[PDB]
Design a protein around this ligand. Structure first.
Ligand SMILES: [Ca+2]
Ligand SMILES: [Ca+2]
Length: 69
């Protein structure tokens, strides 16, 4: 796979699983994911912002990536 903005599971594609997966990390549950891919805005850290962006991306809310926050 490749560094895809949204691919947290590191599978090479943005699937619904990537959304729920990111939600687990943001909650600080202790889930290992690809923070590099999670960062959709390139803020430097995976925060609630990235989560919303990832979800919105799959919800046909945003097509232009990466985001500039
Ligand atoms: Ca994926
Ligand atoms: Ca981020």
């Amino acid at each position: 796979s490749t560094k895809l903005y949204g691919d947290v599971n590191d599978d090479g594609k943005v699937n619904s699983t990537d959304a729920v997966a990111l939600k687990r990390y943001v909650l600080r549950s202790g889930i290992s994911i690809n923070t590099d891919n999670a960062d959709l805005n390139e803020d430097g850290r995976v925060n609630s912002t990235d989560l919303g962006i990832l979800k919105r991306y799959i919800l046909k809310e945003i097509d232009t990536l990466p985001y500039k926050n």
